[PDB]
Design an enzyme around this catalytic site. Structure first.
Site, mmCIF file in Angstrom:
data_model
loop_
_atom_site.group_PDB
_atom_site.id
_atom_site.type_symbol
_atom_site.label_atom_id
_atom_site.label_comp_id
_atom_site.label_asym_id
_atom_site.label_seq_id
_atom_site.Cartn_x
_atom_site.Cartn_y
_atom_site.Cartn_z
ATOM 1 C CG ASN A 87 -2.911 12.029 3.476
ATOM 2 O OD1 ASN A 87 -3.054 13.155 3.011
ATOM 3 N ND2 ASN A 87 -3.935 11.260 3.816
ATOM 4 C CD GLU A 128 0.716 11.399 -4.987
ATOM 5 O OE1 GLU A 128 0.021 12.372 -4.698
ATOM 6 O OE2 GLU A 128 0.227 10.307 -5.370
ATOM 7 C CG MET A 196 -0.812 9.452 -10.698
ATOM 8 S SD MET A 196 -0.609 9.678 -8.934
ATOM 9 C CE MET A 196 0.836 10.398 -9.117
ATOM 10 C CE1 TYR A 198 -4.818 10.682 -10.044
ATOM 11 C CE2 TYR A 198 -5.283 9.203 -11.851
ATOM 12 C CZ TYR A 198 -4.732 9.440 -10.633
ATOM 13 O OH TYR A 198 -4.068 8.420 -9.979
ATOM 14 C CD1 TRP A 346 -8.093 7.888 -6.610
ATOM 15 C CD2 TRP A 346 -6.205 6.684 -6.397
ATOM 16 N NE1 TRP A 346 -7.797 7.804 -5.266
ATOM 17 C CE2 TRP A 346 -6.651 7.062 -5.114
ATOM 18 C CE3 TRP A 346 -5.055 5.898 -6.510
ATOM 19 C CZ2 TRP A 346 -5.963 6.698 -3.958
ATOM 20 C CZ3 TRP A 346 -4.374 5.543 -5.361
ATOM 21 C CH2 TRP A 346 -4.834 5.941 -4.109
HETATM 22 C C1 LIG Z 1 -5.090 20.684 1.129
HETATM 23 C C2 LIG Z 1 -4.241 20.135 0.300
HETATM 24 C C3 LIG Z 1 -4.506 18.697 -0.226
HETATM 25 N N1 LIG Z 1 -4.705 18.750 -1.675
HETATM 26 C C4 LIG Z 1 -4.591 17.527 -2.482
HETATM 27 N N2 LIG Z 1 -4.985 16.383 -1.985
HETATM 28 C C5 LIG Z 1 -4.914 15.247 -2.674
HETATM 29 S S1 LIG Z 1 -5.519 13.719 -1.792
HETATM 30 C C6 LIG Z 1 -7.050 12.960 -2.517
HETATM 31 C C7 LIG Z 1 -7.998 11.984 -1.657
HETATM 32 C C8 LIG Z 1 -7.743 10.612 -1.497
HETATM 33 C C9 LIG Z 1 -8.621 9.798 -0.756
HETATM 34 C C10 LIG Z 1 -9.755 10.337 -0.199
HETATM 35 CL CL1 LIG Z 1 -10.892 9.294 0.745
HETATM 36 C C11 LIG Z 1 -10.021 11.675 -0.372
HETATM 37 C C12 LIG Z 1 -9.127 12.492 -1.111
HETATM 38 N N3 LIG Z 1 -4.402 15.260 -3.933
HETATM 39 C C13 LIG Z 1 -3.968 16.418 -4.521
HETATM 40 S S2 LIG Z 1 -3.294 16.884 -6.013
HETATM 41 C C14 LIG Z 1 -3.088 18.572 -5.781
HETATM 42 C C15 LIG Z 1 -3.545 18.799 -4.541
HETATM 43 C C16 LIG Z 1 -4.045 17.593 -3.820
HETATM 44 C C17 LIG Z 1 -3.525 20.221 -3.972
HETATM 45 C C18 LIG Z 1 -2.739 21.273 -4.826
HETATM 46 N N4 LIG Z 1 -2.067 20.790 -5.962
HETATM 47 C C19 LIG Z 1 -1.829 21.744 -6.779
HETATM 48 C C20 LIG Z 1 -2.565 19.682 -6.613
#
Ligand SMILES: C=CCNc1nc(SCc2ccc(Cl)cc2)nc2sc3c(c12)C=CN(C)C3
Ligand SMILES: *[C@@H]1O[C@H](CO)[C@@H](O)[C@H](O)[C@H]1NC(C)=O
Length: 377
Positions: A87, A128, A196, A198, A346
């Site tokens: 974020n 990131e 990372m 994943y 994670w």
């Molecule tokens: C709408 C866009 C947001 N997408 C994303 N979000 C995250 S945050 C995860 C998180 C952490 C805590 C909690 Cl509680 C809930 C979730 N990580 C990633 S890696 C990645 C995307 C992406 C998107 C495209 N990319 C190609 C690869």
């Protein structure tokens, strides 16, 4: 004991997991000190004045969360503070910092004072990503690479004489690695690099796929979206095995499939999966949400008999891919086979730490520990 072993097990803690209902609540005292060698606190953020600052003053300061995680140094665990995260990486602010030598010089001295004020053992950098802001390589300038490398040098030059650690969490994606990282500089100066390995697949692909494949699968669009390629690529680019810790997800990527009638890999997807009741994020489910769906809601599980990737599970138009104990053991044997520095998770609050699923408390993290401590490969 992990601390007496040749491996690290780097555990991410998240301050926002406190704001979950019922059994999803996670607090600093829920950390199990037998399961980690290093704890990394997510996250501090970059303030508008170009200085590291607390993200959530109510938890971090007023409820003493920094102090309550730094508590774990008493067990011999090293406790670092992470800066950034997904974020906080949305805009240009890290790029503006790293491209400005005067801004870097101010940032570095304040950051070290911040760590020492709260008793942290080190700083973990989680931008990131350099150049490819939130994976979009069109957004940032190529000079983000040199700027980040110089930031790492300038931090190392202050932290290392004080005996403080410096690490970074880094992309598994070949294109991002190529664009954002001066790998020899990072590999020489960082105490570890948490790759990372994943989020290789998710709702953004518009079709189903595995969050964290270990090996190439014949139907993959590319040869490089798997942990085996990624880890060998970091090494090919100049990283010593001892500096690498391999990330493992304690969660799954979820998908709303277009058609309940087909349910395999690479099938069309209309959206992220329905949010879980505890984590409340479309496209994401904690392991303790997934295992309950399988145990008590009849979701069907498909495993890969060749163990190139973990399971997926589905019911109706919902589909989720994730790691189980079986694939975790395979991944840890892979870590040992390559003599890597260790493993990373994670995140602590996403494994089944409450034993909601009856497999024992912390089934995934305990599987990692047991395999790391097993001498056989
Ligand atoms: C709408 C866009 C947001 N997408 C994303 N979000 C995250 S945050 C995860 C998180 C952490 C805590 C909690 Cl509680 C809930 C979730 N990580 C990633 S890696 C990645 C995307 C992406 C998107 C495209 N990319 C190609 C690869
Ligand atoms: C793992 O990656 C290496 C290097 O990319 C490759 O040579 C090897 O075949 C891979 N292992 C598999 C695909 O099982």
């Amino acid at each position: 004991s992990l601390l007496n072993s040749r491996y690290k097990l780097v555990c991410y803690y998240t301050n926002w997991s406190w704001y979950r209902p019922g059994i999803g609540k996670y607090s600093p005292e829920d950390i199990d000190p037998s399961l980690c060698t290093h704890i990394v606190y997510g996250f501090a953020v970059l303030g508008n004045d170009g200085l590291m600052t607390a993200h959530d003053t109510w938890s971090d300061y007023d409820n003493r969360f920094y102090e309550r995680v730094v508590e774990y140094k008493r067990y011999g665990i090293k406790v670092s503070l992470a800066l950034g995260g997904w974020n906080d990486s949305a805009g240009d602010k890290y790029s503006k910092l790293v491209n400005d030598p005067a801004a870097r010089a101010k940032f570095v001295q304040h950051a070290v004072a911040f760590l020492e004020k709260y008793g942290f053992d080190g700083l973990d950098l989680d931008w990131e990503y350099p150049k490819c802001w939130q994976v979009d390589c069109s957004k940032g300038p190529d000079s983000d690479k040199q700027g980040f490398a110089d930031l790492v040098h300038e931090l190392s030059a202050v932290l290392k004489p004080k005996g403080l650690l410096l690490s970074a969490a880094v992309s598994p994606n070949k294109m991002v690695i190529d664009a954002g990282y001066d790998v020899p500089v990072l590999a020489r100066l960082l105490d570890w690099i948490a790759v990372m390995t994943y989020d290789y697949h998710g709702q953004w692909d518009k079709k189903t796929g595995h969050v964290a494949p270990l090996y190439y699968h014949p139907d993959d669009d590319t040869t490089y979206f798997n942990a085996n390629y990624t880890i060998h690529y970091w090494m090919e680019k100049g990283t010593p095995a001892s500096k690498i810790v391999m990330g493992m997800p304690m969660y799954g990527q979820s998908f709303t499939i277009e058609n309940r009638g087909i349910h395999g890999l690479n099938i069309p997807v209309s959206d992220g999966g329905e949010p879980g009741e505890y984590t409340r994020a479309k496209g994401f489910l904690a392991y303790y949400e997934i295992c309950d769906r399988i145990r008590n809601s009849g979701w069907t599980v498909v495993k890969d008999p060749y163990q190139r990737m973990g399971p997926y599970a589905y019911k109706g138009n919902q589909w989720v891919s994730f790691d189980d104990v079986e694939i975790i053991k395979k991944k840890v044997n892979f870590i040992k086979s390559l003599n890597l520095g260790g493993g990373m998770i994670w995140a602590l609050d996403l494994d089944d730490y409450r034993n909601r699923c009856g497999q024992g408390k912390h089934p995934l993290l305990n599987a990692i520990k047991t395999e790391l401590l097993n001498p056989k490969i």
